[PDB]
Amino acid sequence: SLCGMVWRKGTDYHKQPWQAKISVIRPSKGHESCMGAVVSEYFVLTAAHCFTVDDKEHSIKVSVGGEKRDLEIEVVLFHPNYNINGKKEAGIPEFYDYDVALIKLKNKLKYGQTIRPICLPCTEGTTRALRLPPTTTCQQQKEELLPAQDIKALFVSEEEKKLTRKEVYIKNGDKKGSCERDAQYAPGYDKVKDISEVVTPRFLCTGGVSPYADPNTCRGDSGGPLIVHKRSRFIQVGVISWGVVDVCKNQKRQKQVPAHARDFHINLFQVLPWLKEKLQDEDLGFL
Numbered sequence: 517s518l519c520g521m522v523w524r525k526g527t528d529y530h531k532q533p534w535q536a537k538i539s540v541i542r543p544s545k546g547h548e549s550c551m552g553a554v555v556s557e558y559f560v561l562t563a564a565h566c567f568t569v570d571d572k573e574h575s576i577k578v579s580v581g582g583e584k585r586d587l588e589i590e591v592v593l594f595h596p597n598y599n600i601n602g603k604k605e606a607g608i609p610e611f612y613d614y615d616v617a618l619i620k621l622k623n624k625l626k627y628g629q630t631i632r633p634i635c636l637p638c639t640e641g642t643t644r645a646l647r648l649p650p651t652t653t654c655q656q657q658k659e660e661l662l663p664a665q666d667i668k669a670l671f672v673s674e675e676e677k678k679l680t681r682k683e684v685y686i687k688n689g690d691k692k693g694s695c696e697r698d699a700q701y702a703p704g705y706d707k708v709k710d711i712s713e714v715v716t717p718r719f720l721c722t723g724g725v726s727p728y729a730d731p732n733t734c735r736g737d738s739g740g741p742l743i744v745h746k747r748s749r750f751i752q753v754g755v756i757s758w759g760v761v762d763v764c765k766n767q768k769r770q771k772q773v774p775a776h777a778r779d780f781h782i783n784l785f786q787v788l789p790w791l792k793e794k795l796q797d798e799d800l801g802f803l
């Protein structure tokens with residue numbers, strides 16, 4: 517249960533052993549693939565919108581370690597508050613509030629050099645990972661991980677078993693408001709008279725050109741971990757949920773509005789009661 521560590525100078529899955537690759541079984545435009553994070557021997561954390569609402573369990577395949585093989589999915593647990601149609605009335609055609617889900621594997625993962633768990637917030641694993649005293653509370657972990665500033669973080673993109681680590685900054689200080697307001701640059705979100713209707717307290721915000729030029733996410737990054745890296749340990753603080761510009765299709769638009777091209781991530785500190793409940797038997801030592 518040594519979480520968030522690399523287990524030589526190897527490649528791809530050796531550097532990011534928690535990454536999980538997800539494919540939609542009956543693909544269409546916008547519903548082709550997603551990412552996830554190994555969080556325990558039986559669980560992969562991802563985004564709820566990666567699944568079909570009906571027969572969730574048979575709607576995706578998931579792989580780890582860069583393997584060809586798909587793992588048997590026993591159950592998919594959606595956060596109970598998630599509803600993509602929740603705000604049609606308000607003219608918001610897709611609502612990503614609470615966009616998290618857990619995949620329960622039928623078989624126990626065997627940890628190795630290419631399959632390892634990432635650390636989750638408010639666990640004893642994260643306390644040990646950050647080398648903090650045993651007096652550490654959930655709130656103190658949040659202060660350590662998400663201070664009120666621009667926070668260096670990272671996420672991972674995959675293509676044909678090739679993983680690419682991209683560095684981003686979480687706008688959690690004086691730029692937070694502006695980060696969130698830029699949701700209005702997303703197609704469909706532009707007519708909505710109050711933007712905090714789309715950007716709820718559940719969301720962290722990355723992207724833009726200040727303080728640095730953050731790379732942006734694509735639809736296929738949905739559900740992958742947003743990670744803070746500290747002294748050789750990796751802690752998940754968010755789940756990639758939605759972006760202002762799909763830069764895998766639409767690099768043109770990002771060059772039009774680069775200062776406002778944001779990505780939005782479900783803040784794991786904001787869904788702790790649910791995480792804690794679903795993962796209570798996983799030996800993660802939730803605080």
Ligand SMILES: Cc1cc(C)c2[nH]ccc2c1CN1CCCC[C@H]1c1ccc(C(=O)O)cc1
Nearest residue numbers: 702703733734735738757758759760761762766
């Ligand atoms: C669901 C999703 C997930 C991830 C992780 C994403 N990352 C980047 C875009 C994105 C989306 C799509 N999105 C979600 C919010 C409404 C606007 C809509 C969109 C449609 C087309 C384009 C475009 O043509 O660029 C851009 C945005």
